[PDB]
Amino acid sequence: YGPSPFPGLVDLDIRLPEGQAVPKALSNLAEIIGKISIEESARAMGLDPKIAEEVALMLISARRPIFIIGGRATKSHELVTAACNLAVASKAFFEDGLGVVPLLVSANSLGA
Amino acid sequence: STVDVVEKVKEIVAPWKGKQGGLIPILQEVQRELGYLPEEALLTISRELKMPKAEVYGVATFYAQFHLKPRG
Amino acid sequence: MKEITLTIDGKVCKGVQGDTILDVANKNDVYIPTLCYQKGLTPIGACRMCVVQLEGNPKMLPSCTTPAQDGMVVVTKNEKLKDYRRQILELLFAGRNHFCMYCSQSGDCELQRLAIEHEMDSVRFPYLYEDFEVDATDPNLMMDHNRCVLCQRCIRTCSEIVGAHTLDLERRGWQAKVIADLGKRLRESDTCVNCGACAQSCPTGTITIREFAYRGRRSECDAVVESVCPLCAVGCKIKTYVRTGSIVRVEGTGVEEPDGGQLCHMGRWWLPESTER
Amino acid sequence: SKQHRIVLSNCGYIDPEKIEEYIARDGYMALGKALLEMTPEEVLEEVKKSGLRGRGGAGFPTGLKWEFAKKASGDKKYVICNADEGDPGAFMDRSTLEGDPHSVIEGMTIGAYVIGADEGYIYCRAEYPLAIKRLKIAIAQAEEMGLLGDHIMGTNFSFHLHLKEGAGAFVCGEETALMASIEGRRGMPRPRPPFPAQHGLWGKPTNINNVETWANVPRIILNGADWFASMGTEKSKGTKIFALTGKITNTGLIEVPMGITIREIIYELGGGILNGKEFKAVQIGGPSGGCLTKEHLDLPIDYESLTAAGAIMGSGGLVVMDEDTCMVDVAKFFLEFTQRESCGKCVPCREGTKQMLLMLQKICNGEGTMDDLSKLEELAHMVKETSLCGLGQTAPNPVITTIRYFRDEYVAHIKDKRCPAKICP
Ligand SMILES: NC(=O)c1ccc[n+]([C@@H]2O[C@H](COP(=O)([O-])OP(=O)(O)OC[C@H]3O[C@@H](n4cnc5c(N)ncnc54)[C@H](O)[C@@H]3O)[C@@H](O)[C@H]2O)c1
Numbered sequence: 001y002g003p004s005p006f007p008g009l010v011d012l013d014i015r016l017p018e019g020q021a022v023p024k025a026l027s028n029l030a031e032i033i034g035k036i037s038i039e040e041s042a043r044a045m046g047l048d049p050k051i052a053e054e055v056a057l058m059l060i061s062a063r064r065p066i067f068i069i070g071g072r073a074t075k076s077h078e079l080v081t082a083a084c085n086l087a088v089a090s091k092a093f094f095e096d097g098l099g100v101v102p103l104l105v106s107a108n109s110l111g112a
Numbered sequence: 113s114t115v116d117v118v119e120k121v122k123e124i125v126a127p128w129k130g131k132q133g134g135l136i137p138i139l140q141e142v143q144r145e146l147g148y149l150p151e152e153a154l155l156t157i158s159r160e161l162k163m164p165k166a167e168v169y170g171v172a173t174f175y176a177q178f179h180l181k182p183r184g
Numbered sequence: 185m186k187e188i189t190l191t192i193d194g195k196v197c198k199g200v201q202g203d204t205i206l207d208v209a210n211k212n213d214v215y216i217p218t219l220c221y222q223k224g225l226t227p228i229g230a231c232r233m234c235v236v237q238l239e240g241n242p243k244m245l246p247s248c249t250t251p252a253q254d255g256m257v258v259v260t261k262n263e264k265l266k267d268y269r270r271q272i273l274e275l276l277f278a279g280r281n282h283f284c285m286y287c288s289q290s291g292d293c294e295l296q297r298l299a300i301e302h303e304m305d306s307v308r309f310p311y312l313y314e315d316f317e318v319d320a321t322d323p324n325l326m327m328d329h330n331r332c333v334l335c336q337r338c339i340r341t342c343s344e345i346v347g348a349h350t351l352d353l354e355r356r357g358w359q360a361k362v363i364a365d366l367g368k369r370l371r372e373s374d375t376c377v378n379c380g381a382c383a384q385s386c387p388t389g390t391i392t393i394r395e396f397a398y399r400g401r402r403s404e405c406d407a408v409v410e411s412v413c414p415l416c417a418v419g420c421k422i423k424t425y426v427r428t429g430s431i432v433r434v435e436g437t438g439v440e441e442p443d444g445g446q447l448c449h450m451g452r453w454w455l456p457e458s459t460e461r
Numbered sequence: 462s463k464q465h466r467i468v469l470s471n472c473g474y475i476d477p478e479k480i481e482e483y484i485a486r487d488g489y490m491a492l493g494k495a496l497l498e499m500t501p502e503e504v505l506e507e508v509k510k511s512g513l514r515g516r517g518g519a520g521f522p523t524g525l526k527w528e529f530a531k532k533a534s535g536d537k538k539y540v541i542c543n544a545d546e547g548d549p550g551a552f553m554d555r556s557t558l559e560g561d562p563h564s565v566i567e568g569m570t571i572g573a574y575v576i577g578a579d580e581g582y583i584y585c586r587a588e589y590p591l592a593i594k595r596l597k598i599a600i601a602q603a604e605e606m607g608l609l610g611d612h613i614m615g616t617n618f619s620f621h622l623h624l625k626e627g628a629g630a631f632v633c634g635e636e637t638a639l640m641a642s643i644e645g646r647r648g649m650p651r652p653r654p655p656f657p658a659q660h661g662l663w664g665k666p667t668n669i670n671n672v673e674t675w676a677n678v679p680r681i682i683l684n685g686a687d688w689f690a691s692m693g694t695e696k697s698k699g700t701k702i703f704a705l706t707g708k709i710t711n712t713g714l715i716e717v718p719m720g721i722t723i724r725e726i727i728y729e730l731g732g733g734i735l736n737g738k739e740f741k742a743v744q745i746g747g748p749s750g751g752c753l754t755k756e757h758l759d760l761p762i763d764y765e766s767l768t769a770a771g772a773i774m775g776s777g778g779l780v781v782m783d784e785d786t787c788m789v790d791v792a793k794f795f796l797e798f799t800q801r802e803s804c805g806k807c808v809p810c811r812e813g814t815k816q817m818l819l820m821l822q823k824i825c826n827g828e829g830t831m832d833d834l835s836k837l838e839e840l841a842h843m844v845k846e847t848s849l850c851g852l853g854q855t856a857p858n859p860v861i862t863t864i865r866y867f868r869d870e871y872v873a874h875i876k877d878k879r880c881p882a883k884i885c886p
Pocket residue numbers: 515517518519520521526529546547548551634635636656657658659669746747749773774775776851852855
């Protein structure tokens with residue numbers, strides 16, 4: 001729910017309305033591990049069925065995707081897990097870990 | 113009108129989206145239907161092909177056939 | 185084999201079958217004049233100062249783009265090569281307007297050092313006095329096209345290393361120029377991140393960081409210390425230059441890592457601005 | 462007059478649009494005997510002994526280039542036909558694509574069969590609408606008959622052509638600049654050792670060739686190779702299209718075998734200079750080519766012989782000069798062309814070409830000293846030996862060749878301040 005930090009390289013801007021979109025996202029990616037329902041999991045996400053449908057369609061056609069999770073999502077420790085679950089629901093694996101790559105604001109994170 | 117050229121070049125870049133090449137023919141056909149390449153045309157070509165503005169201006173000013181100003 | 189050996193300047197050098205001659209030369213210690221070559225960028229081939237010839241073959245080969253092949257003898261210094269390199273430098277000086285007296289890089293410019301090492305004391309050419317634009321619209325970076333060698337190392341750094349493809353070449357021929365987006369000034373360009381990777385890549389004094397002019401010369405420093413940028417988590421390796429108890433220049437070590445040495449606006453503007461608080 | 466026509470053995474005794482007229486004269490037979498009779502290997506080795514050197518100007522054995530392209534990694538190849546003839550005076554090649562596009566289509570198809578190329582491109586300037594039109598309709602009229610589509614002759618071989626319209630530059634005729642121009646970039650040449658046979662269009666191997674060497678692979682296949690090697694001297698075997706122009710009586714395109722003395726070219730083929738004047742010089746290789754004078758009258762015209770005479774073979778334009786013409790002005794005109802068509806990537810060309818133009822302008826205008834001539838000679842040699850693309854290596858050709866044969870005519874501009882051109886103060 002931001003300014004699309006790359007206005008000119010993105011081809012799918014999905015603006016989520018606030019509230020409790022975390023369970024909505026986690027149930028949405030639940031279908032991608034099993035079936036790969038969507039309408040019921042795409043109401044608090046503020047997306048008409050079609051928008052979430054082709055979101056999932058582009059997410060499934062990618063052989064090696066990656067997710068960039070920002071510091072805004074840390075307003076609730078639930079949305080971080082939601083991103084990390086969207087990572088496993090699309091087989092975004094690397095030999096060092098998942099494709100989550102969090103953006104920490106300092107360097108002494110574990111130290112602090 | 114600067115708003116006419118937007119959609120008019122949208123319809124010229126349509127047959128070329130996601131085809132890995134063919135930018136100098138796009139510029140050639142925008143030169144054929146306008147006599148020159150305005151800044152609006154180049155900006156919209158860059159936004160549609162998602163090719164940087166520096167590249168499209170470099171290739172537009174590389175060839176003598178093209179023109180960046182209205183010709184006499 | 186993947187293990188070849190050449191003879192540069194009589195000195196036998198070791199290398200790998202995949203590299204170029206300039207890489208085998210730099211690998212041991214051997215020196216070859218270079219102006220458009222930058223470690224971390226694909227060889228370009230523009231200045232033609234790295235020319236080198238073999239025994240028997242009278243042709244001249246660019247040591248930075250020609251591969252190394254076991255059994256070849258390499259000659260870097262002779263009368264012909266000195267003459268040709270001095271002619272190239274004199275062309276570069278007579279074409280553009282080089283005023284070393286007030287250049288910010290007037291003691292750490294690659295072109296000036298190459299001119300002094302070749303004993304250049306005259307240009308021999310009619311000194312085309314052309315009018316080139318000086319772009320000082322951006323408060324931080326200055327582009328004085330009177331000092332451009334057209335090595336394109338700024339266009340390669342903002343494209344392959346940074347991604348913000350803000351720079352490219354304008355009209356071809358002698359009228360070649362390094363422009364921002366759609367021929368605009370740097371301040372009007374929206375696709376710029378103000379990283380200064382172009383200022384670090386420029387060998388001449390065309391692109392220059394403005395607020396540390398005349399102070400951030402690497403030749404008149406007091407100490408060079410390498411450390412890490414504390415501001416963010418990426419932790420880029422730096423090459424702090426200290427002069428009279430003040431940081432005058434922060435350069436990005438790591439032209440081998442995927443970052444490529446490009447530091448953020450903070451890493452190379454706030455850190456030297458912090459020592460004067 | 463009397464000349465051997467191989468490439469243009471169709472000219473006007475054919476219909477330029479309808480293909481069955483063309484096939485009525487052994488049109489596509491070669492393709493058959495190369496796609497249904499021979500193997501994809503012998504077709505290469507029998508071309509390799511035909512001695513067909515690259516008619517684009519270099520003079521490289523096309524068999525070797527085809528061997529380099531065939532023995533490549535990965536399964537994706539290309540074949541390109543360079544008709545971006547930018548020399549104003551080298552209409553040699555547009556006339557071929559306008560006369561018989563189907564022979565060039567045959568050549569590209571044979572190349573695709575030998576090398577193993579799926580796709581193929583042709584590069585024509587948008588300034589030549591006639592050739593573009595005729596080729597766009599000829600490829601269609603040749604795939605309808607099952608010669609340019611999928612499963613040609615039903616033999617596991619497909620070959621599509623995409624006619625690419627060039628933008629209009631002269632530097633874009635080199636291999637690397639052409640490859641960059643197809644990919645939607647600037648025609649800025651790149652270093653050679655990664656040749657355009659291991660790494661070409663989109664990284665895939667390519668086999669860029671000229672249109673007149675493409676127009677020769679069809680005939681050397683059908684008429685054989687021992688026959689094609691019986692019209693050369695000892696090294697360069699075949700015919701060559703020449704554009705004889707300038708102050709000559711008979712101007713146009715001629716087709717002479719290789720190893721012909723230049724006298725026959727200007728004294729008995731064109732019939733002499735276009736007045737009762739005498740012959741002074743002849744430029745052989747278009748703008749970026751040397752100029753030969755009366756000491757070179759019995760020297761056969763080859764690839765190796767012209768090089769020793771400072772003149773390159775490329776664009777094939779033979780422009781003749783009267784006795785009145787001055788060689789300082791000739792050099793300036795042919796260098797002012799190569800300056801405007803320079804890329805601006807290498808220092809030697811971007812700078813030395815402008816500087817040589819200025820030196821020639823001041824030597825012709827009477828303001829020249831005696832050491833500016835030495836400066837000009839050394840600058841020519843430096844630009845020739847240091848430049849990246851062949852444009853910079855052959856642009857200071859009309860200065861070296863005009864100084865090595867007309868040195869007295871230059872010194873006369875420094876000492877006696879008068880010019881034999883009788884045109885300028
Ligand atoms: N309009 C024109 O036709 C025109 C204009 C100017 C000059 N020219 C000619 O252009 C030439 C400039 O040289 P050039 O650019 O042709 O280069 P070049 O002389 O090096 O060309 C050699 C040819 O052989 C091929 N080749 C060589 N070694 C190879 C290898 N190992 N693997 C694969 N392929 C290999 C090259 O790809 C090229 O086709 C001059 O000879 C000049 O006469 C032509």
